[PDB]
Amino acid sequence: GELSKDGDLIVSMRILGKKRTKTWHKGTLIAIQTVGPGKKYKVKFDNKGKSLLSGNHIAYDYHPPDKLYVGSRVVAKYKDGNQVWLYAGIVAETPNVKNKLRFLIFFDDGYASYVTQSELYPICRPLKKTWEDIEDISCRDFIEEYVTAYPNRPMVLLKSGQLIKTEAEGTWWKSRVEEVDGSLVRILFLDDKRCEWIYRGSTRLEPMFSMKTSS
């Protein structure tokens, strides 16, 4: 079942591939094979290794041109402090005034951040329902609900200095709003002193949880 091409996927192209670590890495597409129900894509990584991958586990090595939309399946730069990885997610918001022309990404592990146009890459063959390859069931469920409800996004209006409870790991914690950036809020957990950027429509934020529990 060997192919030299599949539409715009051509043997020899540059590509990103998902490693068993779930991080993504640069490489070359060296083969295309039909195996049972679909195609598999053989990637030789630049640094080390080879993998045989489904089409939702490869991404183009170019940045999207208004091509992407809410629900788009992407690989993006996941920056948390001074650590950076390429990791899969979903486009939650496209560039606009309120967000200073950035993309909001909801990553497959539950992380959220804004990224620039030059920090994301379109997955080559996403699933029709783009969330159906998210492994973590809580994340998968959340994204299905979010994408389906879009553009109805209930959010809480929060101000710097405001004190609220924020959930983490099953506990509701005293916290403080440090900063607002578009649809994200930087929450300081007051017992720990760590910060987290959280979506203003997340029911981890007390005012958002309370609204939903009553509604």
Binding site: D80, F106, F107, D109, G110, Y111, A112, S138, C139, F142, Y146, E167, A168, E169, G170, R194, E196, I198, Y199, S202, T203, R204, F209
Partner: peptide, 9 residues
């Protein structure tokens, strides 16, 4: 990695 995800545990 530190994330609490999108919804309460």
């Amino acid at each position: 990695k530190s994330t609490g995800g999108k919804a309460p545990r």
